Symmetry: D2
Subunit: 519 residues, 4 copies
Amino acid sequence: IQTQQLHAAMADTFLEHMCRLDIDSPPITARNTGIICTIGPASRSVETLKEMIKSGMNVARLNFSHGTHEYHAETIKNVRTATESFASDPILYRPVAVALDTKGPEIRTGLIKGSGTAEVELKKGATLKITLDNAYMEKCDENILWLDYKNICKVVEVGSKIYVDDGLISLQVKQKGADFLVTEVENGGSLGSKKGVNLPGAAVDLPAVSEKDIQDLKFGVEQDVDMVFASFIRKASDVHEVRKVLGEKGKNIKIISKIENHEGVRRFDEILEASDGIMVARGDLGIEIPAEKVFLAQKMMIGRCNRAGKPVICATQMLESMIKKPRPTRAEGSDVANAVLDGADCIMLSGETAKGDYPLEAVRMQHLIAREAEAAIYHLQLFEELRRLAPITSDPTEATAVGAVEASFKCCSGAIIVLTKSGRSAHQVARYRPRAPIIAVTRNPQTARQAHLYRGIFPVLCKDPVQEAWAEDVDLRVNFAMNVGKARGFFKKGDVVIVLTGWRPGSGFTNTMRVVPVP
Amino acid sequence: QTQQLHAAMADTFLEHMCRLDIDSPPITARNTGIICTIGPASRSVETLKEMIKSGMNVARLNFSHGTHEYHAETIKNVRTATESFASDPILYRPVAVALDTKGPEIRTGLIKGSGTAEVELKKGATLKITLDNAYMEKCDENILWLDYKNICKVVEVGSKIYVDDGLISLQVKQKGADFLVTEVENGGSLGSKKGVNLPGAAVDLPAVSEKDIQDLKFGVEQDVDMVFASFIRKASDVHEVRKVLGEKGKNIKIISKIENHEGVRRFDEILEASDGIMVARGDLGIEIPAEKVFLAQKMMIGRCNRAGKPVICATQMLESMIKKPRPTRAEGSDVANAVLDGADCIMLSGETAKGDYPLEAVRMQHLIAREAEAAIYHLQLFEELRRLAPITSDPTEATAVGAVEASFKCCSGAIIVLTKSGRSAHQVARYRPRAPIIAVTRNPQTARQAHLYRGIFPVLCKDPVQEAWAEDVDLRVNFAMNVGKARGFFKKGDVVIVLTGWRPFTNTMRVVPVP
Amino acid sequence: QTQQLHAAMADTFLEHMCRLDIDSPPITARNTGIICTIGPASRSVETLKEMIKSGMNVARLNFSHGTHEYHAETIKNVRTATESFASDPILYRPVAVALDTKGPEIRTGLIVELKKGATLKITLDNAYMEKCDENILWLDYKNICKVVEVGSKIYVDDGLISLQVKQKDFLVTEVENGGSLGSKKGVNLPGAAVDLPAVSEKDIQDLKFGVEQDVDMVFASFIRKASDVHEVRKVLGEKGKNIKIISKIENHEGVRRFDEILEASDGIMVARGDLGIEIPAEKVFLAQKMMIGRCNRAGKPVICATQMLESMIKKPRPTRAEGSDVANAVLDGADCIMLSGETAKGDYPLEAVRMQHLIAREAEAAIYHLQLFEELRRLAPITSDPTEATAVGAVEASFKCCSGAIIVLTKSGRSAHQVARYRPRAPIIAVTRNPQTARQAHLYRGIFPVLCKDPVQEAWAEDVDLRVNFAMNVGKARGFFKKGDVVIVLTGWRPGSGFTNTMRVVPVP
Amino acid sequence: IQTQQLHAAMADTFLEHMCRLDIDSPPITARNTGIICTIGPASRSVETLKEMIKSGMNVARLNFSHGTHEYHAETIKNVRTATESFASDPILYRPVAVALDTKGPEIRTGLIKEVEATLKITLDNAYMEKCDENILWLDYKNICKVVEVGSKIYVDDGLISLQVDFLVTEVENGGSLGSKKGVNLPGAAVDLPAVSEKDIQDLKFGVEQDVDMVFASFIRKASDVHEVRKVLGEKGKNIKIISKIENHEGVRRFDEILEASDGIMVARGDLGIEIPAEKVFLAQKMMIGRCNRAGKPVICATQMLESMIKKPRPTRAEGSDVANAVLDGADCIMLSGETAKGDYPLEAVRMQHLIAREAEAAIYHLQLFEELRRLAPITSDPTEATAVGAVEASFKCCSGAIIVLTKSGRSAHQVARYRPRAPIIAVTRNPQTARQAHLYRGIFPVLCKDPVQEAWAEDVDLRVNFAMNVGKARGFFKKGDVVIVLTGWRPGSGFTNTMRVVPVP
């Protein structure tokens, strides 16, 4: 009762649950919410990556809006060197997924005075000309600004608003020309090179998948990435385009659709159906739609992803102040906790890990907050509603999954151990949101990496050879999971755990649930 | 379409009621045990075979009447009838034997030396109660003998005395040292050897008499499955019954009958000391006001469901069927609502012991219970049973609740449970699944006693234990499969839940298709 | 301690059951109306006075038998007994008069043992009407062949005998359940869409007599469809426009078409006797619970009828099944419970009334209002009606302060009816100057109607206050509450129906 | 159903509710959650204050940690000049409250010689201006009684960390150490007085200046509240005391503090130094929950829109934080440096207004109302029964408002605790009640300046009609719509007992 918020867990109402939340009730060891870290100059070394893994990084995200293939290939090599440095003991080895985040249909400005790091300070109530004349693509300054959206003039009008750099610089269109726009600075500030531009009024007509995106996706297949985070998905056909480009060689790569504009929110259901998962890409979303509405979009998408059993990621500015400071703001601590309470499978760090001064501290803080928030979930109602809203099916795997989760609550189990080839069995357990960690034992390295997308899954990669006698191969993997849970302090000899197995080899036959004491 | 599954999906109890559908037929399985009192209408081997076919699960013998010789004969006939079906193990049905004690009864004497004679008592008339044994076979409209020698010490002027299922009422006007003078309040026909109640009084008869001791020891000798202990007032009464059964009868289940005010008052300590409870509504509704009996019934069923201990609803459920071939609408309602309340078993007394329509009464209880079981709001029931049940480190409990959850998810045709002691099946039953629980056991007493639990359909496996443990499990599971298919519970391609141990502790749940 | 308030506080239904306490006494007020069939056992002015004292709220007259002069005399005695208490308006209890129609019937002719397995021809040929026997059975329902099919079952004599149709002016049948057949016996056709008229020629005469006699409500027999209700309404006409029509659901078609029937009616009777001939007896409880639930959801009165205390025709105490049946009808949500032979002809009519009173009061305290009120609200539409919002506000306030009563001024009854649908624990004292409103209010659970006979005060607000004060006196006199208790009072902003909009929480003076 | 998240409102489950939240379902005009703005150089001018009011400020917060009485007196004067500049039109006039936030008890280090291991903490007043990397003086004489070996000590808003008439410590997290820096003792029972000498003078000043409420710093126990109440005295008896919970002891003794107080502030800045920052959300949600359960106002404070000190738009974490405070149940939300010192004070106020209004529409009132009632005690109190009846009626007929006549505010507070969707228009003739009412979610206070009518019934009607006019002018409702109206059976406080459903004229 006095740990894991178990007193609050037993409340008969949500209000009383809130009233019983206890800062002196410490959480379990296991942290269920996956942490996605963007890798860049601050976190790209093998040395730092080892520490990022030890601090809780589950997925390395590469943002292809920046950097050459050479650069990203080296980052990927370093991630794998760091990750495989722990491979000698499979009991302690932590799989690490690699994610390719596409540029997509972005608009960006040019170079301020010929340099990538130069800046000019735009005073408010000034005049600024936007041009498409490539003569100025590297000669941006206080007076003239080039950007790379050739067809911009057709989709904007006088009075249209144009936003630059995370929506912070604000411009109003006064006149239009053949290949320019004369604007007045509505909100000023420093203007740097190659900054993101948004046209919230307008229907931007760029390709769902550009030539650059084709190149990058090919690279992703060549580099054996686990997942693609696809930028600016507006409709199911965009998802299908990425899927078709990845083609047969990339058929097992998971597609996470990033929702970052009004159309994506409107067509969310068809996007979700077509996708392997979703990212709430709050950065651009909060520029494209009023910032005060983002929380509605966030909770709608997390809700709908939870109902569908598909992974959802909360992204962007979660611990933003930690780019410059060792500790986060109170709003940031709140945001991370509330993303977990909403139901997000994963949470993400961008500049905080890619470029900031405290990457390890940012990972460590997400880890601490997620674990406290996981204990604070009102499982009583959540599990009731998930059961009630679930399609009724004669599928034996689904019945075993729900039985296992019910059982896990009844005996407050230290874990649910699941043997899985493709991950699907463990995903089915995760969809019902147990408190207990799900130890997913697999021999498939890609399954192990991809499983990090799901709340609660702790993937472990068995490297023991296959035993002649299948039943004894099954027991070998179960015992492996016992060794892992024990070594990582999830449970100890005599605790009770749940174990899911199947009746024959191959995927699709999980049907056996056992409640067993830890050896 | 069937099994009231539309009502089952309602998000409120009110909408669940609104969706109950007379054109939604129930499953073949009937979960609520039917206990039948055996008497001259139902004692022959020939008639017992039909009682079994009609749905009887437990034969009740009332030791308020009959010699040991006679009851040994009844028990032999029940076993002969039951074992006549043993030659096909798939269709054999276990039948339990229950001994119902006389206990601290008060009875009148014989009207004019006759067992059948009656006299009319008129409202306002005088009637003298005597303890002088010279009148024990000479009762009439003037003088009534009864067998409670200490009656004068526990009543006073103004006390009310009830005779014959509380239908005749008297008021004490004068107390003598060995007699009472009373006025008839509610008159009627007074017959021989009728039951007497003193609702105001603290009756001082032994919880367990010399005769009860003899009858209980006879029960042990005769290998009865359970004892229905009459007039239990407190835990120490239960302890006295348990003591008499002793080590030899330690596995005999003791069902305490609650039929007086003190029993209701002390219910919790009685329940703790017992293996289950009977709501003995006949005497209860004389000892307390009749309008309060439904409160006591619902309280006791609720408390038994909370504790996971069997509870029996008894007495007058189909009373009119003693004389008529069909029940009244109140009787149909009563049987249905007993099941909705949560009763593990329902019972028939005169309807099967002495009436004109014993088979029809068993058949009617069968038909009503099956309809009522479909009409249960499992959504709320299961939620409350889980909430109110303790979460503990017991693996069998967790496997049980998991099995019930899984059965709801895939709407399984059964939960098959391999069990030696019955415990695993009892643990599943306490969570009230919709699916029938086919309990496969090699232990005959387990199979018989399992009828006390809602939803358990016990099947007795007679095959020898196979060499390989996996093969012996498969043998028993396939036996349950063959029974379920023969009884129409399910068919090839349906999904069932199977509970077994993992190695040679029930801790393994499999979701398997019916072959 | 009292009124099962420990059980009331339980967070689950299961724990609510566990706390039900036979030593927790109920309040004085009994909310469920008791309808008593009047006949030879109960027809005298002197017995009717005791019937009223014992708890009768509605006197039911069964027009299946008896002449108009006979029933006129019964009605006269009811009114004589009822008005013997009129001198004290504080203690006067209104008593309603209900006319229960004979309705459409199928009968056999004049005649023998029907054996299982034997064949019996049913003839519509009038030649055999006084010549019925083991081989040819005449019936008076000319269209029988149109509504039955090969395989259809036909019941005869209250379901005693069962026949199955084998060939279809005639029908060749096989006897499924046999027995002694007599003359002029009742016939039922399970599952058939019977096309007999909504009202018989006799019914039309009886309904018109009901209007003459100023009855409060009609219990319309054998209602199968909304159009049947519309025909009864037509017969009662403009003169009978305020008489309530309670549709009796008695067969499969009535259950199947329940929603349209309910919409067109003022209320419903679950007519369990004939329903359990027409459908399997073991299914009647499902039909009862469905109809009670649906009436509760619509806020329309529902009556549970037939055999509730049957054994009390001959014995002074009921069976245990009978006690349970009455308590469960109340727990299900029945607005009224009914007695037929028990009061019409039995040896213990006053005891039968008293027992229904005692059980109903116990069962009312045992209701799980926490869940019941929560559900009624969720299922209660948002509307712009002020009376509806005032009514739900009043019931919520009544729970919050465990009020002694909800007092409602009403002309038509409607404002009180709107409170009743939310099922407060507190009694609803409905104060009216309309005598018919006062009588008809007995149809609704929780309403205790009181008839104010005081003159209209010259300032309308003072006239409102006078009626509220009358209700305070009624509550104190009847021991519903005492000086200092808190009560809820409902009134409106101007005179006339339809303006109830004011809820006050007030001390009993 | 297309407005006010009404589709999501009708969901039978909370998951389905979330799934139906719709960025294209516009909110109503009303915004229920009070906005408390800290005043400072960025927002202290009469002209800027007028714009702060128009942008949505309900409470002006004065932080007495700095500034002279003369300075703060001028700020209050400017607040009142700005507020009364709208008083000509009483239908559109918005009351604005004045809050005094105390400096409170503090532990401070001494004067350096900045110094950049071992470290002695000394209470020797000889070392009080000779602070350096070897010796650190503190002004808390009793520190040695409240700390033990292993106890942590934080210096300068938590920047520097140490593990322990003297203390010997090992620097855990190093940094530049200046002079006169704040010290925190995580887990320690600091026995500093409830009220400092400065606080006593400041609280007297608050009474003289007619402030509406005091935010009392560093409240650890009920007795601290009682001391503040005692200092305010009979002259200050109607000033609301909001206890700031800033440390572990305050969280542990929360129930007794709440009982003694008029309301609570979750002072998250200092709280996240005193306890691990990852646990602050637990303390926030617990305190909001218990305040909602007690029907007492709770304020969410500190860094809600922190990035807006420097930028015109907040971060996505900041938008989320504000929304989630409102969904948690907070009656008010606060701005500190965002409005006191920042570059975008008006934008910060406007953003809290926008987010709060969206969040109020997204509340799952179906379960919220069901639960508030279940936890609602059955009592004999008529006004409580009237309040819950009014809220139930407002849900049943989707009323445009609940109008409440109130002298002290209490009748309107009683409605607010049940969290109606409809705005609560609290009509009062008491100017202080009108200001204080902003502490309660849902209350839109209106100050009636019509002359008292001789016939009390007419005077009651006049005030109800005033509310009707406010609601029509503000777009809450229109002629023919139905609203709920609460009144009492006689003049004076304590007699609210009448709920009417009334058409808007």
